[PDB]
């Protein structure tokens, strides 16, 4: 595998050195598109491009998307700061597309836990759009000490109940110091044309965050990239799990 | 940003010094209307007036409406006491209207948390009108010590369970010493004319307090100003949030 | 305002000294009607009579009906004992009618909390009639010590869980030593003739006790006097309140 | 008796207005002696002077020496600040001498508790001189909150075990922020010349603080003024008390 | 006063720049004597030298010897590392002598708490020499987490009872990782030649650490520099204190 530290350097290098057939540093381009007036907040990375430049790393984003995606986003921040003189910029998403293999919803199982997968299907439902606290900041009213707690949309809220410093239970979530982003759930299932006779379509529920919410409507057929996550059944007293697709990239077909 | 202390002085100054084209101190006028026989209990402030007099402050009421609104209300109280000889008067609301940008319900997301926004839409529902304890006063039956606890309508009731002074758990809410105001909930959603084809209208729930309750009926189309607030989902074990619009100003169209 | 002690003396004086145009001490009359064979257990007091004799006191029954009503009832008990030689008589209600202003159900809001109001409306529902423990007496089985706890019909049951004297948790409500009275709930709403076009009638729930239960049927149109009371929403974790009208006087129209 | 507030004004007035036979404001003199190069830190007040100027107050210093002494010291501070322009000066002791009645050690009993008495006797013992924390300042290491706790030399150390603010038990006495003064114990007993035949001399233990420590040696015969204080026997489970003389003034004879 | 950071720079500068009449950087010399074969582990600093170079700082070592002494020792470590290429060297003591005023034991009182004083007297007793843990290192046997706790010889042992990290009570003092130094107690009292007639000599107990233990025998007459420290009486329930002299420098006369 590839150490975190090293994974960043290699991403930063891919970002600033990969070129298409005509020689253009395509990802410098995309990074530049973050600075324009109506700017994007993601950099869509074509997996085949990454694989053609550094295949070891390209396979590690599939085996370890959590660390791989995050290293890419740190690289983006570096290139911005160092090549564009831009520290002020916010969170920028590294969104991978065009993976080597495409699953159908019915093919998704336990083998895929915490790996980056690509699914083709049709959107059955979309939820309403709600704020999600991606970074909760809890403040102690007794001593003013702040405790930062990052969150995951598929997991439950990680609270804190004692000030790290003073030990009192007079802690509350501080909304203004906390960081929120838009959240939207959706269901995707197999396309009816790929089903055989009276075979029953399987589905999977997904999560969209930030700039990729509200990109799809029921009926839309899409190709998505995401991390398959698991959470215990609502009982939480069974070793069976519910599966959720944390979306990394999504496009219509 | 603008310090609290300073924010008041500048509001008081705007209130007593801003004049229209003919020279009339319009807001002295409005403040005067609080003293008449059937008096108003708000002062509607035209944001464009404020911006034309003190734009820095006008932008701070949008970025920090909680402190900005409250500073304006303190200013109103000053001008009353100092220019009209009136301390006896109660709570007077500073209600801002005519903000620079107007959202549709569907445009409201996490970017708007705790900021003053302006929404145009059509009222789907209105709740029944109920008392809300804006200032709870809990009294200790064992030593007579009183503890004041201000409240927010969108948050849950902040109780107290131990006398600050004697430490006993013989504390109850004292209704007569507490301060109540009328409360009314309502739902607003996108106007059907702004929807495209078979697009689905999104909605947002809101809270009306005091003198602006019962100003709207289902079917009414309105322009409202308010603070977008968030509260955790009813589970309270998810980092997803429900959004509520605490209304500052409302008018029919 | 008017001190309790003093409020009684002034009520007793009004009761025994107020006379109509022909000179008859009308309230001596009414008090006399308590001693007859099929006796009344209330004394209906005409507010305009009280106001014409002692307006300061007449306004204090509206601002402080809880203490005002109770002082009147103590006055009744005095006049009985002193002018009729009657200590044996029970609880006798002071029931005020004919207040200066009449509200419609829709006019009732937070301004009216714990004040005596007069409402005109039409009875939508009446509940079944049930015993209410107006004075709970809890007895300790370990030492025989008795603890008296008065109750309110709109509030929850104030239990006691430790003998004041011995400290044991072997306390139960003693039914025979406790005092019960009949209870009946009812709903009143605006009369359809006062509504405008397709306007929606608002309602308010009420409580009848003792001799005024079973005085009304659904469909009856009535004028009632009562104290507007508030109790927290069933959740009890919101600062919103449910309103209940504790009836002091009721008559058909 | 004489209210605290008023007691100060009257002391300040005595200090600045009392004059001897030749007209000299003797106590302005003494106050001046606090500003010289080797300055005193007490002002010895002749009780007969005080009595001749304001006898009511002179009797209150005997009945209520704790409040009387302290009011005098506040007066001294006023006169300094207002007549000499001196706020910088420290604690200055008001030390009364020449009381109307002089007891022998054997005459001291329970009648004298918390009253200013004057005793003549001979010093049997003197203890070693030690620091006494007259004002303990405890600091919370978890939130930096400081709690001031004044002390008495005859009582035990009043600790604090929970931060007032954060509630943690991480509180310690801060030596540098606390205020210390020298302390010395001594025993005084009846002079052998006043004893009759083979009568046994009684004794009483005393406390000297600050500038009056080390003023006496065993064998010295002295006249002292002090407050008689009581503390429970070392067992602390008997209602019998040990008596200690908190010295206010001391002189050799 | 003088900030810590700044206090170091000024000490380092004094150490490397102060010169005697002939121009020799005397303290470079002394620092050099730390590197020789039988090396010293203190640098004796002549207070008059320091005062003649930087009097502000020289007075701060007397008012704040704890921080002043420590800043000097950090300066020594800097000059060693930077001018001699020596990081490997251990703890080196900054020991001040020749202060402006010399007390007799009997002059030492509460005014001197936590200040550097100089006393002349005769050694009455010397204790046996024992190890003192100047830096206690407690190790958690459950997770291997180490907690460093510096100690003071006059205070009691600051234990730790819960692993900072894992929270278990399976913590013990680790002798090898902890730092020990030799400790010796001694009593010093007034010299009989300075006593008057039959006056009684007072004494004070002291602590010697590390390289200055075993420097004195009973009967030796000495001049010592030290910090006067206080600790509560053994009862620990009285606000009286025992005084101990933490020795910084000692020499025979
Ligand atoms: Zn804290
Ligand atoms: Zn209390
Ligand atoms: Zn009992
Ligand atoms: Zn604290
Ligand atoms: Zn551990």
Automatic annotation (TrEMBL), chains A, B, C, D, E:
UniProt: Zn(2+) binding residues: 140, 143, 163, 166
Highest taxon of the lineage: Archaea
Family: Belongs to the MCM family.
Protein name per UniProt: DNA helicase
Protein species of origin: Pyrococcus furiosus (strain ATCC 43587 / DSM 3638 / JCM 8422 / Vc1)
Parent-protein residues present: 2 to 252 of 1049
């Amino acid at each position: 595998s590839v150490d975190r530290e090293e994974m960043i350097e290699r991403f930063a290098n891919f970002l600033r050195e990969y070129t298409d057939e005509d020689g253009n540093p395509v990802y410098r381009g995309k990074i530049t598109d973050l600075l324009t007036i109506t700017p994007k907040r993601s950099v869509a990375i074509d997996w085949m491009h990454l694989n053609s430049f550094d295949s070891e790393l390209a396979h590690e984003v599939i085996e370890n998307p959590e660390e791989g995606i995050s290293a890419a986003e740190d690289a983006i921040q570096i290139v911005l700061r160092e090549d564009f003189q831009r520290e002020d910029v916010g969170k920028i998403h590294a969104r991978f597309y065009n993976l080597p293999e495409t699953l159908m919803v019915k093919d998704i199982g336990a083998e895929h836990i915490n790996k980056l997968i690509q699914v083709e299907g049709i959107v059955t439902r979309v939820g309403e759009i709600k704020p999600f606290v991606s970074v909760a900041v809890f403040v102690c009213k007794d001593c003013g000490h702040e405790m930062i707690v990052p969150q995951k949309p598929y997991e439950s809220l990680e609270k804190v109940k004692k000030c790290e410093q003073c030990g009192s239970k007079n802690i509350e979530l501080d909304v203004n110091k906390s960081s929120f982003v838009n959240f939207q759930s959706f269901r995707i299932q197999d396309r009816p044309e790929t089903l055989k006779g009276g075979e029953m379509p399987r589905f999977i529920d997904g999560i969209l965050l930030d700039d990729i919410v509200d990109v799809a409507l029921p009926g839309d057929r899409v190709i998505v990239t995401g991390i398959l996550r698991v959470v215990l059944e609502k009982r939480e007293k069974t070793p069976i799990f519910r599966k959720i697709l944390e979306v990394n990239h999504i496009e219509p077909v």
